[PDB]
Design a protein around this ligand. Sequence first.
Ligand SMILES: CC(C)(COP(=O)(O)OP(=O)(O)OC[C@H]1O[C@@H](n2cnc3c(N)ncnc32)[C@H](O)[C@@H]1OP(=O)(O)O)[C@@H](O)C(=O)NCCC(=O)NCCS
Ligand SMILES: O=C([O-])CC(=O)C(=O)O
Ligand SMILES: O=C([O-])CC(=O)C(=O)O
Lengths: 449, 448
Amino acid sequence: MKLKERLAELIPQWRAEVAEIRKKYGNRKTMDCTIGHAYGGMRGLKALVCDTSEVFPDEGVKFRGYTIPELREGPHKLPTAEGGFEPLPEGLWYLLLTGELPTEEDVKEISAEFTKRMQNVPQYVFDVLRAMPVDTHPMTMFAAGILAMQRESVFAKRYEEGMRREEHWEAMLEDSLNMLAALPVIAAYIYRRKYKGDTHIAPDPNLDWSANLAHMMGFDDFEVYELFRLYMFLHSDHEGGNVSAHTNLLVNSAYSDIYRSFSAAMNGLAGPLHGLANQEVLRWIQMLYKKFGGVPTKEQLERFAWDTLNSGQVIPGYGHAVLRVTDPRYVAQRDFALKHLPDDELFKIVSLCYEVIPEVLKKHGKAKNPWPNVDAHSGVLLWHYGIREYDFYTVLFGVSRALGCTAQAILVRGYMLPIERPKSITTRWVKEVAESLPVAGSKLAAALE
Amino acid sequence: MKLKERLAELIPQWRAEVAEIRKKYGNRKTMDCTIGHAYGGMRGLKALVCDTSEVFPDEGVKFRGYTIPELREGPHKLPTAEGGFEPLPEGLWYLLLTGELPTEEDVKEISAEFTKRMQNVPQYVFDVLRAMPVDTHPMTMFAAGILAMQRESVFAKRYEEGMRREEHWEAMLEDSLNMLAALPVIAAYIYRRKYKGDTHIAPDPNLDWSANLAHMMGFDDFEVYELFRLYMFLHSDHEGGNVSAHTNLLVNSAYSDIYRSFSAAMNGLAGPLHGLANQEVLRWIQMLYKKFGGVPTKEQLERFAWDTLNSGQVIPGYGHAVLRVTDPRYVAQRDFALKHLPDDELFKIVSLCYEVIPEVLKKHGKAKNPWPNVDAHSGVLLWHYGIREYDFYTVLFGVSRALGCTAQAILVRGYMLPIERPKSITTRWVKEVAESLPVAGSKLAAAL
Ligand SMILES: CC(C)(COP(=O)(O)OP(=O)(O)OC[C@H]1O[C@@H](n2cnc3c(N)ncnc32)[C@H](O)[C@@H]1OP(=O)(O)O)[C@@H](O)C(=O)NCCC(=O)NCCS
Ligand SMILES: O=C([O-])CC(=O)C(=O)O
Ligand SMILES: O=C([O-])CC(=O)C(=O)O
């Protein structure tokens, strides 16, 4: 398989580069660590490595250096489905791992690997899923199915057998192919059992990864196939620091296999502060429609935007801290909506927000970012095509994010990064030692080296 | 319950006291964050808060300021079981939570709480356990059983209904009581199904928590009850930065409940670099035994030590990623072994390792810590009383670690710490800017 032959060349090299960097640049200072970091969820602390993707304040997220437009439309457009426009997540995955753009042949090889392996979900995984009460939250069901599949781990087996650290990345790759193939099967099972009368649809062997998930969920429509292709591409990866990504690396760093690390990641994504943003934006859009008996006027949205901001509150999916432009994941969803569902009423509200909400934020003068993120746009696309089960939105997110989490876990075992073991501190020590400590970026701080 | 009354007063205080520290002292610097930290698993980086315990390199772990000798033997001895010496983990949990030594009454109230709620493991949790193939790794089964019981989460439910941030710690304690009560039941089920012909033994309502685990595994001797008590006491907690404690805090920080954060932690504990040490040591000790036709001499082991080191191998059970002298968890086990099984052959090798192996590892000079950790001692004890199922040792570890993980997660939801979200950096950036960056502790850093 092309991907694997290539990685067999790239990874020894990267491994050697990282060993040198660590040796020659390890004592290089990047920032001050503070009391506020320790009590403040490490916000801003550069404590982690991720090479798959990278957020730039002025451009948004990039995937191995390429922008979304380059891959979606521009001169480096990733392969599509036949007749398709949207990039195949399969191709992105080739990109995230190798840093090179795939050939049509490269994508086809990965599609075949995915389709084949999708037929190989153990029967016992379904037994595990049916044993859970049907009212269990779907993200609990999703994490449990994944974890039960740990029995098939090639990594865990070869580790018990004795393998060289140099083989880690290969076992991780095999496990990743298996797991990613399985994910839309496990997710669809959950969807069907919970929401569609416990009728089960087999994988179509002539559909790509993304399309098989819509199909098995019971949505056979070309637009849906495209939406899901775009969705999975967009939400694939967003650095290493978000809870789900970090959970994955953290558990990976102890040599736990991908079924253990990613299911752990999903218990993190299941958290209300991490995995619910899409849903809240959608519920808000729906609350605007019902409030104004329809799409509001330009004037009503401004007034309801001013009331909300002036009353201490925020507008969901707008004005996150980091970026200084519109999230390029937002832009690609807008372009999908305009093309495919422009007259949908909830879309019209989101559209109206893109005009109105940035103007009111600039005039309100607090947020250096007046622009939306990805979660502003995703919920209405799902609801339009009939995916209306809020709780399940996080599962779709989860299936996407596996692309990035698997890429990253393959890479860092290729690099042989060590176990994550930070130092914790006590409130006692802080209180004993606080006064004694220099303020950061201060003359005293400069004094103490 | 005394515990909860006590927390109902202490938590609003600590919460106010933490908010004060973040405001007043947040911008105080502790250390240089370096490129090394990012590529080196954050080793040394002060990125986390934990008040349950603290590892002092030249003293070892302390539990709310109290040493292991203080709590087990010396001037602050925690409640034991009727007729017992070894401290009950129920009382240590009280300590961890409140910062205060419990009475007999305090401890008894918690035992009773564990014992009652131990009857309340849902039938569907056993359905899930039985749907996994019996050859599944025990730590996968454990994590999965815990995770299935997320459906009974009080915290997740109260969060959906709308609850005040102040109510969080209450819903976390409730969930923790339920989950701690269930773990011995889930673990014993795994044990009996995997290794003991799938015959199952019910909780005994008149035993304490640790002893019930032993009972439900099929071990009823008093000395085993005592071992489990000690074992659970020693493995309870070890700061906030080990992979299992950290995974628990991380997942907890996004408001995921203790069934989610602790099952995530167990997946981390399942990792060879975190949860496997006890077994490696036992195998190694048994390998010496077989090799020397019994207990070696000082000379034989001294030689063997050197030949292992100079062949680029690890001496398992010695050295740590933070500890710097003898692990006081090791000394507690040695005491137990001298007291209860001084003539066990494998123990005698462990003992002999204690004399010889430190001095050897000093001279070799690669190990930063030349002394033994806790995993040097735990295996021979388990093996001696007939717990011989290597892979299951990590589950025992996990049951015990739940004590600290639940304590930490209750407290932090009391303090209202926010989501954990560090920044990742790229190799590309590092290659772009590294030369231009100041060396940590330089004149250039002092100017910048
Ligand atoms: C716990 C442990 C993993 C910590 O590793 P660490 O933080 O990298 O350790 P150090 O800072 O002491 O490493 C410095 C050197 O000492 C070596 N070292 C430490 N203890 C050693 C031992 N018992 N035998 C051989 N070499 C040892 C390391 O391999 C390293 O050499 P390297 O640069 O060639 O890799 C390590 O002590 C170990 O492997 N112990 C044996 C297994 C064990 O008992 N684990 C239980 C841990 S709870
Ligand atoms: O929090 C982050 O860094 C990124 C993220 O989760 C998201 O895109 O939803
Ligand atoms: O703290 C560590 O790094 C490992 C350990 O001993 C423990 O978790 O008990």
